[PDB]
Design an enzyme around this catalytic site. Structure first.
Site, mmCIF file in Angstrom:
data_model
loop_
_atom_site.group_PDB
_atom_site.id
_atom_site.type_symbol
_atom_site.label_atom_id
_atom_site.label_comp_id
_atom_site.label_asym_id
_atom_site.label_seq_id
_atom_site.Cartn_x
_atom_site.Cartn_y
_atom_site.Cartn_z
ATOM 1 N N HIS A 40 0.806 -1.212 0.000
ATOM 2 C CA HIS A 40 0.000 0.000 0.000
ATOM 3 C C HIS A 40 0.839 1.261 0.000
ATOM 4 C CE1 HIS A 40 0.365 0.269 4.530
ATOM 5 N NE2 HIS A 40 0.183 1.555 4.276
ATOM 6 N N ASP A 84 0.145 -7.504 1.956
ATOM 7 C CA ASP A 84 0.646 -6.124 1.893
ATOM 8 C C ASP A 84 2.181 -6.178 1.938
ATOM 9 O OD1 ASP A 84 0.737 -3.367 1.749
ATOM 10 O OD2 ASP A 84 0.190 -2.956 3.778
ATOM 11 N N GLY A 175 2.824 6.793 8.606
ATOM 12 C CA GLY A 175 4.166 7.181 8.251
ATOM 13 C C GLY A 175 5.204 6.143 8.601
ATOM 14 N N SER A 177 4.360 2.995 7.929
ATOM 15 C CA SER A 177 3.995 1.915 7.012
ATOM 16 C C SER A 177 5.172 1.484 6.150
ATOM 17 C CB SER A 177 2.842 2.335 6.108
ATOM 18 O OG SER A 177 1.707 2.584 6.879
ATOM 19 N N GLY A 178 5.281 0.178 5.941
ATOM 20 C CA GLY A 178 6.345 -0.355 5.118
ATOM 21 C C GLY A 178 7.598 -0.682 5.878
#
Ligand code: CA
Length: 223
Positions: A40, A84, A175, A177-178
């Site tokens: 995402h 994801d 922020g 994320s990942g």
């Protein structure tokens, strides 16, 4: 990261910032040319920033490399965030050192109760917004699958796990994320989603990297 601590410059040498004019997501350097993030987080025109502490100040240990290829997982569902996970190849191999290092992939799926380190440049508040410039760190346990499904009825899949505290107060956030979830020196998760941040009975939900090792390895070997 809500309720964390300041990591220290370059103490998390596998952490990366994804940048398209501004930081928008985190990632994990898994070898000299490949980065893992969350699907995402996908967008075109990514520059990968290794070696970062203050993402607003050139400090001396940064490497700025453009992406040549992004590969979202074939079965990614943006409605449910199942699968994801995304792979990013760098145009050039990074130069690996004390402060820019890869993180190893897992041979085993980590178990509930394992303490892990989460990191990122995301929002530090549960109510409102204050984004840090330097890297924030959180130690947190993986929660049992039953607690995780109890907090998020009908939403957790075999490809997700919960980590954090049901009491609230400590969590990843927008922020982050990942970014990486590292347990015993292995990348076990990816910051994926959650219901707000640091709310009670709403822990953080993470991509279960132990399910994607073969896809990561045969994707890297052919690209
Ligand atoms: Ca910097």
């Amino acid at each position: 990261i809500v309720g964390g601590y300041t990591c220290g410059a370059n103490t998390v040498p596998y952490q990366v910032s994804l940048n398209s004019g501004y930081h928008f997501c985190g990632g994990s350097l898994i070898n000299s040319q490949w980065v893992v993030s969350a699907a995402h987080c996908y967008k075109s025109g990514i520059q990968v920033r290794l070696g970062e502490d203050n993402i607003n100040v050139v400090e001396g240990n940064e490497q700025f490399i453009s992406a040549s290829k992004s590969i979202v997982h074939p079965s990614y569902n943006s409605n449910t965030l199942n699968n994801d996970i995304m792979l990013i190849k760098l145009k050039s191999a990074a130069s690996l050192n004390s402060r820019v290092a890869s993180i190893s992939l897992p041979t085993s799926c980590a178990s509930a109760g394992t303490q892990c380190l989460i990191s990122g440049w995301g929002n530090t508040k549960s109510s409102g917004t204050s984004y840090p410039d330097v890297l924030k760190c959180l130690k947190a346990p993986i929660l049992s699958d039953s607690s995780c499904k109890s907090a998020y009825p009908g939403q957790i899949t075999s490809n997700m796990f919960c980590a954090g505290y049901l009491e609230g107060g400590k969590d990843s956030c927008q922020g982050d994320s990942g970014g990486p979830v590292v347990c015993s020196g292995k990348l076990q998760g990816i910051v994926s989603w959650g219901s707000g941040c640091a709310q009670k009975n709403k822990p953080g939900v993470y991509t279960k990297v132990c399910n994607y090792v073969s896809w990561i390895k045969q994707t890297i070997a052919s690209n």
